[PDB]
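#struct-pred

JT: dropping the chains for the assembly here, can someone run the whole complex?
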Amino acid sequence: DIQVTQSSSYLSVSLGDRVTITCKASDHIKNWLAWYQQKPGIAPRLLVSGATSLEAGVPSRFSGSGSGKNFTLSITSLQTEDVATYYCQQYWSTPWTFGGGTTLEIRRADAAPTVSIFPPSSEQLTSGGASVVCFLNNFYPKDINVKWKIDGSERQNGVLNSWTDQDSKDSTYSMSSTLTLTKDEYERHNSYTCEATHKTSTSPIVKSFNRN
Amino acid sequence: LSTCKTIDMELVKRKRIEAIRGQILSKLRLASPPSQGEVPPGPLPEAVLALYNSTRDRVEPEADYYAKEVTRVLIYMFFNTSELREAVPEPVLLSRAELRLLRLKLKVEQHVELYQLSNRLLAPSDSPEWLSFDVTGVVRQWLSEGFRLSAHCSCNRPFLLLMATPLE
Amino acid sequence: TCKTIDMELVKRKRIEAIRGQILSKLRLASPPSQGEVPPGPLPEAVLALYNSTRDRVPEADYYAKEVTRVLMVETHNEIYDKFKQSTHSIYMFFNTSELREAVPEPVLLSRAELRLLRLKLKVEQHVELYQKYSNNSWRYLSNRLLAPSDSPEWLSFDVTGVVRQWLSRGGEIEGFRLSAHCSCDSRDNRPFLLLMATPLERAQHLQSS
Amino acid sequence: HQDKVPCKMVDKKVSCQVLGLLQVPSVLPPDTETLDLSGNQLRSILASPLGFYTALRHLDLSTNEISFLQPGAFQALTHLEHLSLAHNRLAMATALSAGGLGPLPRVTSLDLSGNSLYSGLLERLLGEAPSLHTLSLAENSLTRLTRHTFRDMPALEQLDLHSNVLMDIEDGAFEGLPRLTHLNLSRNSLTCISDFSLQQLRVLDLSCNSIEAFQTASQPQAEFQLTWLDLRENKLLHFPDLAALPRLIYLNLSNNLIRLPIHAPSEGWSARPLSQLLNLDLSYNEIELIPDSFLEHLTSLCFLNLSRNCLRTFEARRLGSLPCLMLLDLSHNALETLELGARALGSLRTLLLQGNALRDLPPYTFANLASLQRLNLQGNRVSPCGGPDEPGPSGCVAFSGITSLRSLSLVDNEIELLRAGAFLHTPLTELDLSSNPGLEVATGALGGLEASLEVLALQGNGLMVLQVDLPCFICLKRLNLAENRLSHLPAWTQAVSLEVLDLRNNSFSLLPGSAMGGLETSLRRLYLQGNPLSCCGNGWLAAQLHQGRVD
Amino acid sequence: QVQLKESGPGLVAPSQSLSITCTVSGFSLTGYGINWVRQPPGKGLEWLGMIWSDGSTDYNSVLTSRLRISKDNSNSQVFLKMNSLQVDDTARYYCARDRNYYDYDGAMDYWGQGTSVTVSSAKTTPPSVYPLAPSMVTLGCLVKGYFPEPVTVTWNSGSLSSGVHTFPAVLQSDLYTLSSSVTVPSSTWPSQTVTCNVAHPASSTKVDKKIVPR
Amino acid sequence: LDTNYCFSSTEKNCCVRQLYIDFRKDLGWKWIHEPKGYHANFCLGPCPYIWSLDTQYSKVLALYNQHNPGASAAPCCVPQALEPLPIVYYVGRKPKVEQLSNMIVRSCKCS
Amino acid sequence: ALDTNYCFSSTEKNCCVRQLYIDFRKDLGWKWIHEPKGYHANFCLGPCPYIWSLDTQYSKVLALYNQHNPGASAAPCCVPQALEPLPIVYYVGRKPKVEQLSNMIVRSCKCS
Ligand SMILES: *[C@@H]1O[C@H](CO)[C@@H](O[C@@H]2O[C@H](CO)[C@@H](O[C@@H]3O[C@H](CO)[C@@H](O)[C@H](O)[C@@H]3O)[C@H](O)[C@H]2NC(C)=O)[C@H](O)[C@H]1NC(C)=O
Ligand SMILES: *[C@@H]1O[C@H](CO)[C@@H](O[C@@H]2O[C@H](CO)[C@@H](O[C@@H]3O[C@H](CO)[C@@H](O)[C@H](O)[C@@H]3O)[C@H](O)[C@H]2NC(C)=O)[C@H](O)[C@H]1NC(C)=O
Ligand SMILES: *[C@@H]1O[C@H](CO)[C@@H](O[C@@H]2O[C@H](CO)[C@@H](O[C@@H]3O[C@H](CO)[C@@H](O)[C@H](O)[C@@H]3O)[C@H](O)[C@H]2NC(C)=O)[C@H](O)[C@H]1NC(C)=O
Ligand SMILES: *[C@@H]1O[C@H](CO)[C@@H](O[C@@H]2O[C@H](CO)[C@@H](O)[C@H](O)[C@H]2NC(C)=O)[C@H](O)[C@H]1NC(C)=O
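RK: done, full complex below.
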């Protein structure tokens, strides 16, 4: 098989600047490689068939280059409609293989997350289950880490994290982390905390609450 | 050097239309379209319109290129042999003859058998449906009786639709 | 219509068309090599199978169909013990495992016709074939009129749909029954199954190795 | 077990062909310049064994089973000029190894025929070849030619694509080969040609296709250099408008459906012209009538074949029309009359009219042809005249005045009576009057043929006596009197030049030395099977059986 | 014009087979190839296989008994079958037409809209909305225990839209669970009333749980 | 080959082409009282002869099933499925109901 | 609709099935088909004029036009109507195989 790889899963760039997406093949496929664009909700669309030939209807801002193993998809001036994930797919020999993709993101200044710890609701406690929630909203860049500690011991059971896509207004990310437990085990501990590891601070952003 | 693309469809259709013109006239064995001066004004007779509906309704030498005249003549189901000879003047003129029957009760599937020698299964579709059985060979022997329909045994009124070459 | 055609040029194109016709129907990129062919005459079982097809009696119909045959279970193999032969019906059972071996998947089957060697008919007779639908009930099938003949003749009944059901959801041993026709007014070598199917080696759904 | 058969070595020429080799030999001298590994069981060409012969210029790997090509194999041969990979399993080469064939800087001629190559796989396999001059992709499975098919070979001038399944050719498919001169598309599935834009092309073979319509681009920036066009065994319905090919010299339109005296009804497509033409073959078509404007444009035409057509009349009445026409073949038509005007076909040496329906003609039809030499009227029920006197009754064709005619055939012409002055002033060298049952040769019918005639044939005429004085035919060499009722022949008093004498199936009983005294020196073959020979009654026939005679 | 449309079951039980039909128009299946590509909810396209115009098939290297592509040229349909689906097989499955520039090309030019395939064997379950309560202040709502997707969150019926974050759902205990948050200035909240609206299509539920601070 | 496709693309291959014949509009005939028209249709497209080789790529073999299934020397795009057309027309003063054989083309094949 | 029985050894000018036997070894150069050695494939050949543009002739020539549709094809063609299968026996490697090819022998030709 001929594996194909995109080294950068994410690429930061601002509007109107030059963008280049790399994609390397395991062996010399010699032009037989395509480029694809996929909006977050839309289906994939073919941009470049062959190493250089642009598909009909594609803006002239996009361009492809490369031969053998190294290839690159360049954007002359980034537009708001170009904010999407891009894939490369070789077709020198079956099976056709895709790359890991490259999701574009808008660069901006760093911003610390706004942590918020929430005790389980009294209405949920009546159902026999309790879940502490911790939001981490409006931070940049996307890389962040979350740790739960009940009574000082790190917790990973019952943790369910979730991440939003980059906001279209301020270009910031948000993260949610819910720690679900039974009502009896939740009543067996008092301390609950939500530490946050991010590049904005050398120390974790802590938000904790006692049970009562 | 390049191969052809973009086939013209308007010109091709016109050539097919003119071929169909000579085709319909040749099957009817008419050099020119018949004069319409003797046609009486008003709708077609109900017996003619009912005959045309019998052919369009949904239900051994090969058929000839030329047109075949259509005539219709109407549990034992007997038919007058004298009436069949009037619709088909000669026994050789007949090309296909199939009896038609309108089944009503279609609640469960049932197999039936025809005798003067054929069998067909009736699928349960509660809507009424016409049944047809090819009996061109039996109607040919009659031109020179009736049929009986019985269920399979393990150990408008029904009519026969006739198609024949016109005497002309 | 005015005369200008020489068959010699047409014959050459007809011959060359047959070359690609046979290769395409057999899905052969090139004629198979004769290296591993065992020396000597063809085996009697293969020659007998080839004689059975030549004997006189959908897109996929262009391509070749592999031919196999499976004889019915012998009459002394619980057929005559558990199943009584009346004056009308003769019971012919087949091994479903042997059918699934000749045709691995039901979809591959294209035609299956039961074949009978009639002994001798000096008078016409109407017969009917039946399928063992339930454990006791019989399902009606086709019927055929047997013309008189002073010599034995081979008869064939298309049972393609029945064999396909046996390949998919069939029992350990199924079979057919052939009885004479009885109108409501009247109260009164061995048979084998010829199979036509697509070979697994040329099945479209499998990627070439 | 026999030891291996070695390679036949010559000065920088190694021949390992048809030795049953499984792999490329590694014990060959490094200075080898020509290697022939054809006809072996090579299944792959690795770079490891072959790379040792850096001096190679001609490498033939044809007719093997090569299915794998190591990516750097041929790049090591920096002096390689000819590479032959014909008849191999190279269709799967791209699936096994990436990059395909590499760059070939010095290869001038490449053969990739018979490798079951496919559209797309071909483009993957082909590499850049700046020096390539001849490329062969014949006997493959190419269905189409794209604008990106033949790239990175600008020096290409000959391209062979016969025996493929080509059906579609894109507009700019040959834009990358400006110097192309020979293009062969014979034995393919082309159905309709809408354009011809190959300016530098000179030879084009479109034979054995299904081309219902052929059309070139009109009014080019420069004149197309095409001089050889082949469209035989197609389905053409029309004579192509070849005014866009001024330099065209050869044109074979044989075996089509052309009528005189553009649309493609099976496909549904519709969208001094030949003053330099020399050879035109319109045989085996459906031409029923020849337009007057058609022949006038075909000046300087030397050969014109119209055999096997529905022609009923051929009249070259225009002044000076078809002046250089050396040969005219109108055989096997329905020709009832033909009007060859005087001083029209001045340079016509051969006129083939056999298999027609000629009966009544102007008496001096063939007499007006200035340089007529060969004339074939077989199966044409023509009646020669009596020449100077006894004028023929009705439309008798006069053969008495043609002083340039040399060979004449009146076979199967139902000739009842050959009049006396039939060829009084036509110095024929060969004359065939065979297959004319009941022929009555008048006294002196071969009037002025005693000096010129060398070949004479009267087979199947059922003659009971021969009315011509054969011994005075001093130049006669071959005489055919077979299938007749002749029993006696005129005596040869003086020696003649007759060599072959066919008397088979006759009523000869005695051939005495009195009547056969002459030609004893010149006779070489004497056919006599089928005669009621009187055994030992003649004598001379037995003595001649030894030297200077045959069976 | 040219179009491709997938037809999927929507839900697939574990260990059960998956069947998808790709209907096409504007081109003949006898002259064009049809690829099968699936995309999980997580990033990444995954080519499954293709059926060539002649009916021949090439598949992805991990196919054993789990992929079988056929077609019906007369009905312009391409059939994909996948055996014994599991949790990691939940993905969106596309069919893409091959750009038949060459007979052996591979580049895909026309894609269908795709079909969602979920492997859960879960019945419909209504959500349970829980308010989340403790210079700006953040409040939130928790929509837990619903099935299947999706669910729409809104604050004050749209009066509060800026600064709102509705997080993607996560499958947990064979059921979906999501959370939404809303940030407001401390001068407004808690002096104002804030209520989130969570709607579910299958359960036909649209709770309006009021937030009670502290 | 899909009929829904055949009559919905200008491609030079053998297929059924859509064609409705109106006796009044297309032919200018009023002597055919019934019907007012019918979908006669027609076949169009080349059936190119395929020059066969002993060796041939595996995927190219599909061309013979479509271009020349019968291995004819000159294949033609001719109808496969045919349907009769019953009509009603007057001959003088007597109305006549007759059925014309092989009028409607439903599928085309190379032969 | 003119079968072999009529046009074999018959002076027929119109189109019908023409005799042609193909030997796999001699005509095709094939040795991989063990059985049979050949078969009577036959072929259709001959002009098919439009039924309006046809000269009077013997009564049997009308059978060609039983499936005639002048408005369908651009040019009517004489194509086979009845076809018969050809079972063969050939080796693929070491296993003998009996397979039947559909529509190989031409029995009757018809004008289209
Ligand atoms: C274009 O290509 C065709 C196909 O190769 C050329 O026609 C072929 O020419 C060869 C000779 O070069 C012929 O082969 C000969 O066959 C005879 C027996 O018939 C054999 O004794 C000879 O030794 C030689 O092998 C072949 O028959 C002929 N085929 C056809 C269909 O014509 C053609 O000459 C090429 N045209 C140009 C302009 O290059
Ligand atoms: C143009 O192309 C045609 C092919 O359509 C060439 O026709 C060929 O001409 C030769 C010579 O006349 C024919 O050979 C003859 O065959 C008969 C037996 O049929 C034999 O008795 C003769 O002695 C002679 O050998 C050949 O059959 C014929 N080919 C076809 C298919 O009819 C023609 O030569 C080409 N003309 C030019 C100027 O290139
Ligand atoms: C139509 O008539 C022309 C003559 O005007 C025929 O062309 C002639 O064809 C023969 C046989 O193909 C040629 O003879 C051969 O020439 C080659 C090359 O010199 C030689 O190697 C052979 O041994 C043989 O002598 C002849 O040269 C050629 N004449 C011309 C002027 O092209 C043509 O074949 C006829 N067509 C048909 C269908 O009969
Ligand atoms: C002389 O007559 C004999 C006998 O009729 C001829 O030999 C026959 O020729 C025909 C035609 O080729 C063959 O079909 C026959 O088989 C031959 N033999 C017989 C016994 O008929 C011979 O060809 C004639 N020779 C001449 C020069 O006319």
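JT: nice. The interface with chain E takes residues 1-5, 8-9, 11, 58-62, 66 of chain F (CB under 8 Å). Residues 62-67 of chain F form the longest helix (6 residues).
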